[PDB]
Amino acid sequence: CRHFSFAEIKAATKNFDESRVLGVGGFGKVYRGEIDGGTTKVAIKRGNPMSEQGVHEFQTEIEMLSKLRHRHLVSLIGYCEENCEMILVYDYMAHGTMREHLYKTQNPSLPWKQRLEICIGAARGLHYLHTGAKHTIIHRDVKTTNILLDEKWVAKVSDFGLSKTSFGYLDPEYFRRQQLTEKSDVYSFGVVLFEALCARPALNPTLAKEQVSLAEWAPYCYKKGMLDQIVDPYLKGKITPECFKKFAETAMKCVLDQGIERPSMGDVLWNLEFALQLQE
Numbered sequence: 001c002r003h004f005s006f007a008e009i010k011a012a013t014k015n016f017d018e019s020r021v022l023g024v025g026g027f028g029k030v031y032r033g034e035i036d037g038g039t040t041k042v043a044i045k046r047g048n049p050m051s052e053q054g055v056h057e058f059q060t061e062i063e064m065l066s067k068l069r070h071r072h073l074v075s076l077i078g079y080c081e082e083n084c085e086m087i088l089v090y091d092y093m094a095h096g097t098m099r100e101h102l103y104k105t106q107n108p109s110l111p112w113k114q115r116l117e118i119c120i121g122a123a124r125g126l127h128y129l130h131t132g133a134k135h136t137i138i139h140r141d142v143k144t145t146n147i148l149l150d151e152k153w154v155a156k157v158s159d160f161g162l163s164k165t166s167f168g169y170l171d172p173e174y175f176r177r178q179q180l181t182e183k184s185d186v187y188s189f190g191v192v193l194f195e196a197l198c199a200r201p202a203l204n205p206t207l208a209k210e211q212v213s214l215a216e217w218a219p220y221c222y223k224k225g226m227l228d229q230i231v232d233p234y235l236k237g238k239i240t241p242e243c244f245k246k247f248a249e250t251a252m253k254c255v256l257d258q259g260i261e262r263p264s265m266g267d268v269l270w271n272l273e274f275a276l277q278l279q280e
């Protein structure tokens with residue numbers, strides 16, 4: 001993992017010019033830049049050392065990503081703790097977050113098979129975190145803004161500041177059992193799956209009481225046989241009956257009340273690949 005000068009960070013971002021800002025996260029501003037003389041596109045996150053939750057996330061993202069390698073995980077090229085700063089350098093994901101392609105957006109809608117393949121890609125990332133590191137990693141922050149898309153539309157998991165060895169995605173059993181297991185990532189992923197299908201936020205505080213949380217609302221409509229009515233309008237008529245059923249029953253199991261009843265990510269990943277095959 002590469003240490004960067006604070007001078008290279010300025011060279012890459014052209015001294016943090018707002019022409020290169022990509023957005024704002026809970027950590028700071030995210031800048032697009034180039035390093036190694038313009039062969040490498042990157043994204044650079046500037047955090048604030050005054051905040052020690054920011055300090056905690058900066059060090060956690062470094063100690064996690066520096067030892068992980070997976071096609072479906074955002075890669076951390078390097079960092080900069082110079083002059084008591086806090087900077088992280090990732091590879092640039094040219095197509096932003098998954099949420100920017102589902103709703104509240106001007107981007108075109110994604111075809112069903114591309115959505116399915118994005119969820120499969122993210123499930124592979126999560127499966128690696130749970131079974132491929134030295135110990136289980138619990139991401140704790142699985143959501144549609146933390147799934148990024150590169151120039152070939154490969155889905156990649158990011159945002160490791162809260163991981164250990166958001167509202168609407170929170171494992172409700174965590175506020176009861178007060179323990180945390182990788183099944184909490186499965187809960188959050190099941191919500192991602194429903195967002196991909198319904199193209200609406202996980203929490204929409206303005207709706208009728210039963211519709212506020214996608215996690216409780218989508219299962220409810222499936223049992224009542226009206227899940228087809230809240231499906232993304234672009235997707236209506238584009239999912240074969242058997243894919244629709246395997247997909248929805250996979251998402252329903254992910255958001256069960258009790259973590260012990262939920263599938264593992266290996267199981268989820270397998271059932272999504274099965275769904276893709278039933279679609280074709």
Ligand SMILES: Nc1ncnc2c1ncn2[C@@H]1O[C@H](COP(=O)(O)OP(=O)(O)O)[C@@H](O)[C@H]1O
Pocket residue numbers: 022023024025026027028030042043045074090091092093094096097145146148159
């Ligand atoms: N590696 C990246 N490549 C491209 N754009 C990125 C990358 N990381 C973050 N972004 C952009 O920066 C924005 C801020 O994301 P992030 O800093 O993770 O904050 P949060 O996860 O709290 O929304 C994202 O919405 C996205 O547009």
